[PDB]
Assembly symmetry: C2
Homo-oligomer: 274 residues x 2
């Protein structure tokens, strides 16, 4: 049979229990009114963060497939069962942001303008290259690098900080309750995605403590582009402060920044050398 | 955004609405008692069909990944969203049969003995070869052949006939209520899997009516192994008739056989030349 005690079978079971939410059930009618109420300058304030998320949700939905292939080819059946929940979660994440964009009237609008160079180095290179590599090279090194970029950086550092940022800004304002319900569901799903990456990296590290060094190195290789995108969104936020003024939000970009730094270092600390 | 009117987006929505069942919730306690109550010769009667299903559930969970890859690479986002529900359904199908095997005490038992040559030509060759081909060859021909073997033959002909057979035999007997609840859920999921294959084959046929001929040809190429496995299970059933006698089941293998023939021909008729 299945190995019922396998950590990824247990995570698969939790995913089924905790993954019933449906983006089609979220009421976005108030978000539509909120967005319509905003000034043109308040309207822009929110779009860079939605742009960063929308694109990556689509990217990881497509880019997790090579990991499922590689682990399937290695006969890791429980990992594959769990990854069917991962891929389905990401599909719902694509759906959720696309429903919000449609509801508030920006579906026809092209948000790529808010992807700078550092973003693109992660989104159009580091991520798809590392995942696609697994189709021809499933070595421990390749699998660690894939989980590091996908689960520890894209999800474990950027997404987690993006969820926090969303709450720090719009939950305060009382704005966009449907989007924030969605963000709460995404954040719950993301816990399991990150735990998959931790388990995958740890079980490879457990074979040969020298893989720990590779993990730390790949995290550090990506940090410059993490902070460079974060700096660029900070610059944007500081230059368009009408939403912050209108809604009495002292948006503390220094606290966000230290949260990103904090996310990055705590992901490192969830991998043990021994 | 997503194309909200796309047939596969609509199928994805139905999958979310109709795909909440969880194999971990099925009570198999009575199945355990039923199986324990059976004579050794009654015990064997049921295993060939469970053997055919268990293996194929695992095969399609792994073997649907190349289709998702190929359609993703073609930018068919709605198809991919739907296929996340397909892959997750098949994961639950693997789980369901493995839970039943565990509960009734045959988890440690090796059921490969009930796969004959015709089965293996589908299971170990036609199916994985046709699906894996999509990694390097996503031509209309390759995509039609993949959906024909997977969705129209393995699911649309063999699985559908296997669900019917399960009901024709054990629903009658009053045996194995947990397994039959599972079979009802599998059969509901399978409707969407088959509709994916119909849509995929039809939209390729729509481009060039000559692909219709390829579809019919591939169906006919596989028919000999479909019926050869069906004949071999019929032979098995006729040689071990203690369960049929004990439970007053006049198991009409000729009616099953014509149901298989019927499944095969109606799958053909769900593809239009024009
Ligand atoms: C303004 C302070 C910066 C806060 C950091 C914001 C990061 C934006 C979101 C981009 C990453 C989204 C990744 C999603 C990945 C997934 O869905 O698994
Ligand atoms: C005794 C009459 C013959 C009845 C035919 C029985 C076929 C047995 C089941 C084997 C095919 C299972 C395919 C599952 C595919 C899927 O889960 O999508
Ligand atoms: Fe994720
Ligand atoms: Fe199926
Ligand atoms: Mn820079
Ligand atoms: Mn023969
Ligand atoms: Mn996501
Ligand atoms: Mn199935």
């Amino acid at each position: 049979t299945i190995d019922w005690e396998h950590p990824m079978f247990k995570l698969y079971e939790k995913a089924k229990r905790n993954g019933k939410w449906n983006p089609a059930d979220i009421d976005f009618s108030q978000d539509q009114k909120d967005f319509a109420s905003l000034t043109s300058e308040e309207k822009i304030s929110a779009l860079p963060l939605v742009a960063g998320f929308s694109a990556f949700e689509e990217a990881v939905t497509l880019d997790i497939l090579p990991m499922a292939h590689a682990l399937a080819r290695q006969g890791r059946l429980e990992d594959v069962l769990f990854l069917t929940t991962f891929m389905h979660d990401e599909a719902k994440h694509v759906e959720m942001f696309s429903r919000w964009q449609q509801a508030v009237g920006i579906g026809q609008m092209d948000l790529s303008v808010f992807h700078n160079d550092h973003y693109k180095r992660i989104f159009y290179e580091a991520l798809p290259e590392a995942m696609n590599r697994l189709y021809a090279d499933d070595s421990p090194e390749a699998v660690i690098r894939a989980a590091t970029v996908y689960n520890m950086i894209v999800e474990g550092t950027l997404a987690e900080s993006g969820y926090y940022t969303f709450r720090q800004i719009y939950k305060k304002a009382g704005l966009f309750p449907g989007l924030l319900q969605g963000i709460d569901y995404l954040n719950m799903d993301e816990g399991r995605h990150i735990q998959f990456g931790i388990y995958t990296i740890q079980r490879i590290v457990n074979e040969d403590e020298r893989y720990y060094e590779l993990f730390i190195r790949y995290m550090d290789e990506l940090w410059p582009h993490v902070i460079g995108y974060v700096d660029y969104l900070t610059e944007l936020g500081k230059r368009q402060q009408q939403l912050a003024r209108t809604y009495a939000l002292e948006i503390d970009y220094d606290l966000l920044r230290h949260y990103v730094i904090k996310q990055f270092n705590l992901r490192k600390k969830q991998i043990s050398r021994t």
